[PDB]
Amino acid sequence: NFTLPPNFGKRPTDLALSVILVFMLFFIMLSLGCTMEFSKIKAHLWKPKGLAIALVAQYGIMPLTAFVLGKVFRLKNIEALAILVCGCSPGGNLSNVFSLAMKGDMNLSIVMTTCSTFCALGMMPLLLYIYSRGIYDGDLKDKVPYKGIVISLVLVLIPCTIGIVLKSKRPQYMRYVIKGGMIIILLCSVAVTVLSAINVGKSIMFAMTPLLIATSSLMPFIGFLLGYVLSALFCLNGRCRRTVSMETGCQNVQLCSTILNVAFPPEVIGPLFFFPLLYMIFQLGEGLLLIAIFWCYEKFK
Amino acid sequence: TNLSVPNPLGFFPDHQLDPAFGANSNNPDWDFNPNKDHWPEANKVG
């Protein structure tokens, strides 16, 4: 009894949103390119101590948390499979923003996200095959976008490199560039919120089951907490710990949405078409809440 | 059977870094898996 509004995915508003998101990505990456340095990235890649910790934390906490949340809340097979697919996904590129708002080591946020989206090529089908047994009796190894992952990695690294060279060579226009980036990001965010609201309409009221909301709100917080705790167990300096926490918590959500749609028909998925959106709107909320808490603490310290 | 170019800041299937933006239009050629799975074990808690 769940059906999306007619002609979903092809109306002009959805095209407007899908074009606005690309400008979001380009200008966010260009702005973040004004913080990183090539020499420090080379140092962080030639002395891998926080990078391995980030990889271990992400790929040993997020999939296991997804599996445990599926087995504890007594979810359906399709819901548990969606959660598990949304767990093994790479770190994504919101971790860079959340580690910028918390005074992290930006150069390492780029090593962990590029390396953990290139290790994803190998470790996403492996973890899916290891964990999906007893849930799905099928092949999910040929539906992972390998070529898409590589192309996305290169296309995401391009604007960051542009920003890095701009900072290194011509710092005269850096202030204007960063101000324009911030204002464009703000405008495109105000655009995205209202455009997504109009696009979704009343069809989201069918995708707010208490189990779905509870799991999609408990997964990112547990990711944050466990990433921070495990990074602190290895006595890191206080900034790498926050970067690791905010890279373990945040996930590349679009991969789950493009895998579920390829594997399953629109009627089997049902309300789970909106679960990636719930994950995004809860991880944004938790990131903002933690940023506010951190800044309130830093004021008093 | 999946050549979608994912967008990190995305939450819908039609959020891809393709300049042609053919996913939002008709005949979107990004999922070459016409043999979907209608599996009946999708409402069982086990």
Epitope: T3, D137, G138, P265, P266, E267 | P34, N35, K36, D37, H38, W39, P40, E41, N43
Partner: antibody, heavy 123, light 109 residues
């Protein structure tokens, strides 16, 4: 409950023909209408399917890109439109429903079939 | 990419009152989503068994279904003069439905 087909006839190769499936006794807006083709003196074959409620449509491998299936919830009919009919497409076409089982939640046998309209293509 | 079926007996011949066992084997795990049809020559197919073990309403009690992993069987308890026709095997747990080759039960002499 019954399904009726119409539009079977002689079509030259490369031509186009439209088959209608005038469903009666239920509503196509929710059902799952299938088209099944039987070559003369051969076993049954599958052609195309429609799920109008979800607007999800899948075609077989042999007729992918040449056959178009539609639904008309206003007139309670299902249409299969073919293009570039090769000489090997001459057969009898059946319209089939999709039973739903409530005790075990999934689809059941294709209960109701139409009589079938002979589509023969030859120059 | 299609899910092939390998209906084993092609032209099984059995006289009146015997036992008939037609075996359909799926190349991939299709769960319990196999149906058995009985197409008499010159008429539209009917439905006999759905979900590979149940029984469609109106079918006599002679027919039966089974499933052993990926192997599906159809058993006729006692053949009747109206049981001589062609039987097909189907699948559900995949978008592209694939039928079977067909088993023609003919009289013996």
């Amino acid at each position: 409950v019954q399904l009726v087909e119409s539009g079977g006839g002689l079509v030259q190769p490369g031509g186009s023909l439209r088959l209608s499936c005038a469903a009666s006794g239920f509503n196509v807006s929710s059902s799952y209408i299938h088209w099944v083709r039987q070559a003369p003196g051969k076993g049954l074959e599958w052609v195309a399917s429609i799920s109008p409620y979800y607007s999800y449509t899948s075609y077989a491998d042999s007729v992918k890109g040449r056959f178009t299936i539609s639904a008309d919830t206003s007139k309670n009919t299902a249409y299969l439109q073919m293009n570039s009919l090769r000489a090997e497409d001459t057969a009898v076409y059946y319209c089939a429903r999709y039973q739903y089982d409530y005790y075990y939640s999934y689809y059941a046998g294709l209960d109701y079939w139409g009589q079938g309209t002979l589509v023969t293509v030859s120059s | 990419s299609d899910i092939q079926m390998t209906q084993s007996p092609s032209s099984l011949s059995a006289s009146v009152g015997d036992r008939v066992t037609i075996t359909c084997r799926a190349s991939q795990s299709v769960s319990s989503a196999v149906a058995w049809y009985q197409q008499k020559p010159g008429k539209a197919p009917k439905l006999l068994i759905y979900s590979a073990s149940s029984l469609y309403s109106g079918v006599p009690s002679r027919f039966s279904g089974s499933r052993s992993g990926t192997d599906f069987t159809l058993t006729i308890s006692s053949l009747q003069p109206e049981d001589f026709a062609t039987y097909y095997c189907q699948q559900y747990r995949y978008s592209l439905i694939t039928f079977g080759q067909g088993t023609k039960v003919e009289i013996k002499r």
